């Protein structure tokens, strides 16, 4: 790998510089190099990995949605034929997006998840696994769509089971997991009632635990609770 010659600490340092410079592709490449050193990641390092790939795939997803919208309009009645170019370019972006998701899933499978024993690391990685299968599901249309959806579901479910046993209801990882699993239910699994129920129960159980928190932890938890509330307002 192109980062094989760089020290682990230098890769982490450069990932932080890349973030400051908004160079998210570089940041992801540095963090991939750091993971491939084979040591477990600290909490801060896990968050750098996540930020890097979330920003890369986020740009790809936004571009894919623009292109898919254009393609769908081209397929309406009365639309002038423009040739294969819209489909081709949507496919190009789609293939790049799938490659990034496969890269992340590959890091998780070789070998982040299997070495993650603490709840905070294991839930973090399983949530990531659910998220990147969810991004694959957003673009899937073929024989494997059901299996991709079930892979996302299974990863989220394992993360949920651990988080409910091992973490308080206000823990930000637990909250973000529940938020994303609720989005999965609504947008991927055609289960809006499940999405709504999960968001409401998550919000209410976190509300009841806020009294145990410091001011700083309260701020962290309430920020994510507000996203649950925003979704509930959209969905109801």
């Amino acid at each position: 790998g192109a980062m094989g010659s760089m020290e682990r600490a230098s890769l982490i340092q450069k990932a932080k510089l890349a973030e400051q410079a908004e160079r998210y592709e570089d940041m992801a490449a540095f963090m991939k190099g750091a993971v491939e050193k084979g040591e477990e990641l600290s909490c801060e390092e896990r968050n750098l990995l996540s930020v890097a790939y979330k920003n890369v795939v986020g740009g790809q997803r936004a571009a894919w949605r623009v292109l898919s919208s254009i393609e769908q309009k081209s397929n309406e009645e009365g639309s002038e034929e423009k040739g294969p170019e819209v489909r081709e370019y949507r496919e190009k972006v789609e293939t790049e997006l799938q490659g990034v998701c496969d890269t992340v899933l590959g890091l998780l499978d070789s070998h982040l998840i299997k070495e993650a024993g603490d709840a905070e690391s294991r839930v973090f990685y399983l949530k990531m696994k659910g998220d990147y299968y969810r991004y694959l599901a957003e673009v899937a249309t073929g024989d494997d769509k059901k299996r991709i959806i079930d892979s996302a579901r299974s990863a989220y479910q394992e993360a949920m089971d651990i988080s409910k046993k091992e973490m308080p209801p206000t823990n930000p990882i637990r909250l973000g997991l529940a938020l994303n699993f609720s989005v999965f239910h609504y947008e991927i699994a055609n289960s809006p009632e499940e999405a709504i129920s999960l968001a409401k129960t998550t919000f209410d159980e976190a509300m009841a635990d806020l009294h145990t928190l410091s001011e700083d932890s309260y701020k962290d938890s309430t920020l994510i609770m507000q996203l649950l509330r925003d979704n509930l307002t959209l969905w109801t």
Binding site: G176, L179, N180, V183, D230, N231
Partner: peptide
């Protein structure tokens, strides 16, 4: 919908 930022 909003996911984790």
């Amino acid at each position: 919908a909003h996911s984790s930022p």
